[PDB]
């Protein structure tokens, strides 16, 4: 059994692309992320998603954008895609000026807080560190 994907619209694809961080954070600029954001924009355009690219957002901006997007009427939309490109730690995504809990972002789309997306796939794609460990790999 599979999700109904033939609503009039595939859905929104929100891409949050944070490249430059406030010096108060001590986080290096994320060179190459523009290529990512553009690669993702074309990819999801070909899947028939309404793409909205957002650049260099503070933590307050992410939360407000996510809050506002979750308050839209998604009744005509099949799904929802959010892509986060940023620095991070476990459970945490960085605005340009500091950390945001990932749970805070995703809670806006929770089944009881975003009724027009209830029963519909909500995909979060997160390019961000989750710690400082390094995988040294094993030969095969």
Q: Would you name the residues annotated as active-site residues?
A: 87, 129
Q: Which of a copy of itself, another protein, none does residue 74 bind (CB under 5 to 8 Å by kind)?
A: none
Nearer to another protein, 73 or 112 (CB): 112
Give least dist CB 140 to a copy of itself, A.
6
Nearest to 78 by CA among 44, 42, 38: 44
SS3 85: strand
Query: Minimum distance between the CB of residue 111 and a copy of itself, rounded to whole angstroms?
Result: 4
Piece in contact with a copy of itself (CB under 8 A), picked from 9-17, 28-36, 38-46, 113-121: 113-121
Q: What is the DSSP string of 44-57?
A: HHHTT-EEEEEES-
Classify residue 120 by its DSSP letter: S
119 scored as a contact of a copy of itself (CB under 8 A): yes
121 binds another protein (CB under 8 A): yes
Contact letters (x/-) for another protein, 15-54, by CB under 8 A? -------------x-xxxx-xx--xx-xx--xx-------
Measure the CA angle with vertex 68, ends 65 and 73; round to 5°.
135
Q: Which of 33, 36, 39 is nearest to 18 (CA)?
A: 33
Of 65 and 92, nearer to another protein (C-beta) is 92
Q: Which is nearer to another protein, 65 or 85 (CB)?
A: 85
Residues 6+ apart with CB under 8 A from 2: none
């Amino acid at each position: 059994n599979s999700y109904k994907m033939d609503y009039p619209e595939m859905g929104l694809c929100i891409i949050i692309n944070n490249k430059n961080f406030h010096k108060s954070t001590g986080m290096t600029s994320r060179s190459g992320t523009d290529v990512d954001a553009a690669n993702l924009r074309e990819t999801f355009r070909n899947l028939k998603y309404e793409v909205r690219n957002k650049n260099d957002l503070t933590r307050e901006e992410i939360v407000e954008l996510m809050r506002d997007v979750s308050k839209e009427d998604h009744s005509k939309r099949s799904s929802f895609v959010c892509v986060l490109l940023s620095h991070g730690e476990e459970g945490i995504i960085f605005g340009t000026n500091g950390p945001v809990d990932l749970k805070k972002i995703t809670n806006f789309f929770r089944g009881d807080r975003c009724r027009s997306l209830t029963g519909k796939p909500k995909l979060f794609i997160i390019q961000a560190c989750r710690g400082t460990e390094l995988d040294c790999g094993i030969e095969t």
